[PDB]
């Protein structure tokens, strides 16, 4: 209930902050068709963690653990596998809106890791 309201609140505040103060993230959301004002958390773009070695990027009830489909990269229902995206809002150093190398299921929130990609 209000735990979801908690993470919704500070996760959109984190998204607004990181979208305003990081231009590579702003250009990444505008390559996705994402505006300043987005209501839900699943309209937020998420980049992979492989970026963290290619370009130097720098700007729990607070992490939105989500199991995404490999094609649509949209969340699946709980119980089925998918790519783990995190959406940490504790950081101000770098936008922690990432997708892992990990596959797993999520149960209402405890997050399981089955295997890596390759």
């Amino acid at each position: 209930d209000e735990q979801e309201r908690i993470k919704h609140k500070l996760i959109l505040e984190s998204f607004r902050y990181h979208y305003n103060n990081n231009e590579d993230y702003k250009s990444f959301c505008n390559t996705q068709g994402v505006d300043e004002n987005i209501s839900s958390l699943d309209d937020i773009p998420v980049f992979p963690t492989s970026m963290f070695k290619y370009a130097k990027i720098c700007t729990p009830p607070w992490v939105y653990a989500r199991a995404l489909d490999p094609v649509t990269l949209k969340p699946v229902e709980d119980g089925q596998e998918g790519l783990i995206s995190y959406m940490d809002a504790s950081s101000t150093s770098y936008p922690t809106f990432i997708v892992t190398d990990d596959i797993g299921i999520i149960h209402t929130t405890t997050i399981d890791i089955v295997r890596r990609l390759n």
Binding site: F47, S50, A55, P70, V71, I103, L117
Partner: protein
């Protein structure tokens, strides 16, 4: 629960009491029998007396190809079904594979000219030819061993055909991904004529690299020549488990590229580049991975290539794309979007076009992805052409290949084609800088006597007479 047979002499072995292993090719189980000591002894004792001429060999291959040409051929239908089910091919791609088998088997002039261009004459495999100061005959090596890779069935088919044209006996170890093509080809030989020396020269089997090495080593010891096709570890295994006095034809992993110079007709250019990207799901060694555009309208070519890739999305669809491959596609699309690389993709992640700057970071899955770069001159492409890695250097306006072939060869091209032709290893050329059946053959030389002088001395070669008289340097030209 589908069983794959084992052919040894010219027929399937009685594998009832054998041990079986499953493979899980495309989420579907397939039982292959494990080779035992009796099969190794049967392989060792195989000695087929092959007295056919190249005419007879080519005519038999033509008959087999005409058998494969009929769409009602039961073995062809089964092969297409297995390509669709266990390799994940689309019905179009499987039909195309069967059609290419038929095509390369039924092209007689192509085989004659392969023999002629590689060995010098199509008769050198049956007659003693007076090349110069000698009579040369091309004899087989015998019991050729072929270790197949798995991506392109036509690679294994052409390997077997090359070994057949040189009158070699074939011991084919199928790949862990395509255990059907060699079995289908050998069983087709059997269906045509089971008593033919070519049908009796095929022995198709399978062994893994994780199993005990005794039996595969015993099979490798009776080779006389080895043809390895896989990646790095496959060629390393072939090198480590071959008798040191036996030759190995190595077909390693390659990385082919495309060059678009400045096409006035952009539509055919895009058609060709899309063909090269999409054929065999970009899994071949001649498949285009990076495109290097020269000119002033890279975005017009981008749009036309997008259109042609959308066409290939329908006329030749993708495979089945397991979960991890889908996730790779998505994550790599994200990676390329995070770098303003002008990413475009097709529906159901059918293809991927990425316009990154030259020398940039780009992760390459071989699904149908292609990276296109603006270079502005050929001198900027040559630093990205390696010696034994770049195989095909596709050039789109073929005329422009006449002013680039020299520097591409100097930098290790090994092939220059027309962009609609990357899958066709045209007759008269070479494979990986190597004319393969020059190495599947033993050149036996019958040198003519001392009364036949050389072209430089004009003196009968009497070495004893001139060692007595102490006369050598008066004859040196």
């Amino acid at each position: 629960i589908k069983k794959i047979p084992m052919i040894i002499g010219g027929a399937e072995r009685d594998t009832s009491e054998h041990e079986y292993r499953e493979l899980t090719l495309n989420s579907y189980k397939v039982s292959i029998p494990i080779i035992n000591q009796d099969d190794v002894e049967a392989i060792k004792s195989q000695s087929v007396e092959n007295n056919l001429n190249i005419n007879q060999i080519v005519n038999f291959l033509y008959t087999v190809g005409q058998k494969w040409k009929s769409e009602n051929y039961s073995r062809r239908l089964t092969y297409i079904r297995d390509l669709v089910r266990f390799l994940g091919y689309s019905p179009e791609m499987a039909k195309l594979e069967a059609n290419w088998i038929s095509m390369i088997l039924s092209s007689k002039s192509a085989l004659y000219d392969i023999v002629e261009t590689e060995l010098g004459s199509r008769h050198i495999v049956d007659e003693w030819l007076p090349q110069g100061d000698c009579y040369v005959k091309a004899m087989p090596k015998g019991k050729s061993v072929h270790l197949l890779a798995g991506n392109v069935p036509l690679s294994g088919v052409t390997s077997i055909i090359r070994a057949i044209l040189t009158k070699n006996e074939c011991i084919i170890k199928t790949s862990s991904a395509d255990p059907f093509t060699a079995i289908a080809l050998a069983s087709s030989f059997i269906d045509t004529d089971e008593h033919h020396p070519i049908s009796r020269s095929m022995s198709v089997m399978y062994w893994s690299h994780n199993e005990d090495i005794a039996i595969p080593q015993q099979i490798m010891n009776c080779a006389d020549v080895v043809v390895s096709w896989g990646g790095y570890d496959a060629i390393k295994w072939a090198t480590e488990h071959t008798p040191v006095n036996v030759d190995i034809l190595k077909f390693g992993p390659k990385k082919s590229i495309a060059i678009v110079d400045n096409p006035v007709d952009i539509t055919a250019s895009a058609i060709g580049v899309a063909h090269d990207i999409c054929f065999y799901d970009q899994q071949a060694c001649f498949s285009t991975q990076d495109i290097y555009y020269i000119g002033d309208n890279i975005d017009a070519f981008f749009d036309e290539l997008v259109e042609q890739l959308n066409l290939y999305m329908d006329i030749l669809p993708k495979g089945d794309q397991t979960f991890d491959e889908k996730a790779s596609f998505s994550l790599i699309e994200k990676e390329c979007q995070f770098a303003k690389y002008k990413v475009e993709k097709g529906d159901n992640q059918s293809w991927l076009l990425v316009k990154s700057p030259l020398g940039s970071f780009g992760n390459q899955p071989l699904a149908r992805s292609a990276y296109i770069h603006h270079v502005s001159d050929i001198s900027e492409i040559t630093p990205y052409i390696e010696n034994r890695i770049t195989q095909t250097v596709t050039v789109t306006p073929w005329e422009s290949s006449f002013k680039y072939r020299d520097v591409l060869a100097s930098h290790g091209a090994e092939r220059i084609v027309e962009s609609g032709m990357n899958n066709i290893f045209r007759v008269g050329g070479a494979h990986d800088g190597m004319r393969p059946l020059q190495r599947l053959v033993k050149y036996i030389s019958h040198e003519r006597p001392y009364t036949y002088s050389t072209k430089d001395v004009a003196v009968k070669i009497e070495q004893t007479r001139y060692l007595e008289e102490d006369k050598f340097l008066v004859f040196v030209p």
